Amino acid sequence: CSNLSTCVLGKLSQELHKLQTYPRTDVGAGTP
Numbered sequence: 001c002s003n004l005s006t007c008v009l010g011k012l013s014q015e016l017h018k019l020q021t022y023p024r025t026d027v028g029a030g031t032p
C-alpha cells in the first residue's frame with residue numbers, strides 16, 4: 001500500500017470477493 005485510502009477500500013473489497021462468506025457448497029447438504 002501507499003494511498004492509505006484506495007488501499008483500504010481495495011483491500012476490503014478484494015477480501016469480500018475472495019472469501020464471500022465461504023461459498024463451499026450451496027444446494028441443501030452444504031458440504032465443506
Ligand SMILES: *[C@@H]1O[C@H](CO)[C@@H](O)[C@H](O)[C@H]1NC(C)=O
Nearest residue numbers: 001002003006007008010011
Ligand atoms: C493503492 O491501493 C491499491 C488497492 O488496495 C493497492 O494495490 C496499491 O498498492 C495502493 N498504492 C498504489 C500506489 O497504488
